[PDB]
Write a protein that binds this ligand. Structure first.
Ligand code: HEM
Ligand SMILES: Cc1cc(N)nc(-c2cc(CN(C)C)cc(F)c2F)c1
Ligand SMILES: C[C@H](O)[C@H](O)[C@H]1CNc2nc(N)[nH]c(=O)c2N1
Ligand SMILES: [Zn+2]
Length: 411
């Protein structure tokens, strides 16, 4: 019960005691492992205090004033506020620590070497969807920083009763639209075809093309959500060119610089933040491999193989692999010749091993989801493929949450 994780590329071995602090459950039992299930699966005051205590204990431990008077009075203070309101409010400092450690514990995140460099935007004074829009806009502009991207999170008011939730209804602040066609097929992004429809049902006017930036659907205090259009000067986009093939210009592709997940739930000391968009920068593969070449996404292996003139008759010609490697050189190249922050799957996976070492040394471990950490191309030529990882669920944490349109008691 002081487990060992080995690397088989380097024979390096690390000891994990951090998993002992784990509290939540994984999905796995002694007789079944669910490590490749994607989504494995109101709160009272009784449950609420251990979670405040637990969180408050590590936060003061982190500023190296564990259990002091300043801690015990904060423990007493929260306890009484959970008596008084059956909930409580986080200090500015507790919110930043909590948020940063949700990221630090995001076991499916490969870019976590950066977890301490996170800009926390406190939007807990927000009351309206217009305020949400305005907080998100400052987030986008700040985190984009002219392309020298910066990690940021914007934390809207915590869930209270359940019927008054702040939700960003988009899965990401910036996504391209998804239009099915009369002839069945799909323009834009097939991922978002329902969301694109919801925006239309609430009154969007779609420029029914490809890389159409969707509008924000912001629900404030449980109210029915409202559409807002991010000023296009804030939506930084990178046109994809290849450093060889000039028909790659005519491919006519671009991606947005800012990956910013808006649909997850941030958990700090038992408090539930249902609207907490967070942003970093892209590893190339999520664009080049997944976005562009997932079969039910942009599905561009067909055309990129074409304009290379490749043996598409047969499967064993690896024409798909060949076209994938070029696509990803191009995504990278475009982003870097534009000074827009991006990381290649090699650089990022090496950093994660370096980050893993730091974690096991100064923290006793690092939760990691090998299914998610290994880049979706060239697996074994990246050092994380060869790295055993213990996955376990620490807190504070980012958590999946149901889409608001399945849950929303509407009017
Ligand atoms: C700064 C550069 C960052 C890089 C290079 C990076 C990299 C990645 C990648 C490649 C994924 C997999 C995405 C996918 O395949 O769908 C991911 C997932 C994730 N990352 Fe990061 N990320 C960064 C920033 C952040 C930040 C700022 C946070 C939180 C504040 C965060 C927390 C997460 C979460 C919650 C997930 C998804 C877990 C899930 O979907 O179940 N990351 N990251
Ligand atoms: C902060 C950040 C950096 C980065 N490189 N990627 C992501 C990211 C994560 C998911 C995970 N789930 C919501 C499916 C989906 C995406 F499309 C992303 F872009 C987020
Ligand atoms: C079936 C499997 O769980 C699913 O494809 C997962 C696999 N690993 C992944 N890893 C990352 N980074 N992103 C993903 O979307 C997925 N999808
Ligand atoms: Zn398992």
């Amino acid at each position: 019960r002081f487990l060992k994780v080995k690397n088989w590329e380097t024979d390096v071995v690390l000891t994990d005691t951090l998993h002992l602090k784990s509290t939540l459950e994984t999905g796995c039992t002694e007789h079944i492992c669910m490590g490749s299930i994607m989504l494995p699966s109101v709160a009272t005051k009784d449950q609420l205090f251990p979670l405040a205590k637990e969180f408050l204990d590590q936060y003061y431990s982190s500023i190296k004033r564990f259990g002091s008077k300043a801690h015990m009075d904060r423990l007493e203070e929260v306890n009484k506020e959970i008596e008084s309101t059956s909930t409580y409010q986080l200090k500015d400092t507790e919110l930043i620590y909590g948020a940063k450690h949700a990221w630090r514990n995001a076991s499916r995140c490969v870019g976590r070497i950066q977890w301490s460099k996170l800009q926390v935007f406190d939007a807990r004074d927000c009351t309206t969807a217009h305020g949400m829009f305005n907080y998100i806009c400052n987030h986008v502009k700040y985190a984009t920083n002219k392309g020298n991207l910066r990690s940021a999170i914007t934390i809207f008011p915590q869930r209270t009763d359940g019927k008054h939730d702040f939700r960003v209804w988009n899965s990401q602040l910036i996504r391209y639209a998804g239009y099915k066609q009369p002839d069945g097929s799909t323009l834009g992004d097939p991922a978002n075809v329902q969301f694109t429809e919801i925006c239309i049902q609430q009154g969007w006017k779609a420029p029914r093309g490809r890389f159409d930036v969707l509008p924000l659907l912001l629900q404030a205090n449980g109210n029915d959500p409202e559409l807002f259009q991010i000023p296009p000067e804030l939506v930084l986009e990178v046109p994809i060119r290849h450093p060889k093939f000039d028909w790659f210009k005519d491919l006519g592709l671009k991606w947005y610089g800012l990956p910013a997940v808006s649909n997850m739930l941030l958990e700090i000391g038992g408090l539930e933040f249902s609207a907490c968009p967070f942003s970093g920068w892209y590893m190339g593969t999520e664009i080049g491999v997944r976005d562009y070449c997932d079969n039910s996404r942009y599905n561009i292996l067909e055309e990129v193989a074409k304009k290379m003139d490749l043996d598409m008759r047969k499967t064993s010609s690896l024409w798909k692999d060949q076209a994938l490697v070029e696509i990803n050189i191009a995504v990278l190249y475009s982003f870097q010749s534009d000074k827009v922050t991006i990381v290649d799957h090699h650089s990022a996976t090496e950093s994660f091993i370096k980050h893993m070492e730091n974690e096991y040394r100064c923290r006793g471990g690092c939760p990691a989801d090998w299914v998610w950490i290994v880049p979706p191309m060239s697996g074994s030529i990246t050092p994380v493929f060869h790295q055993e990882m213990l996955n376990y669920r620490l807190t504070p944490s980012f958590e999946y949450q149901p889409d608001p349109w399945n849950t929303h008691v509407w009017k």
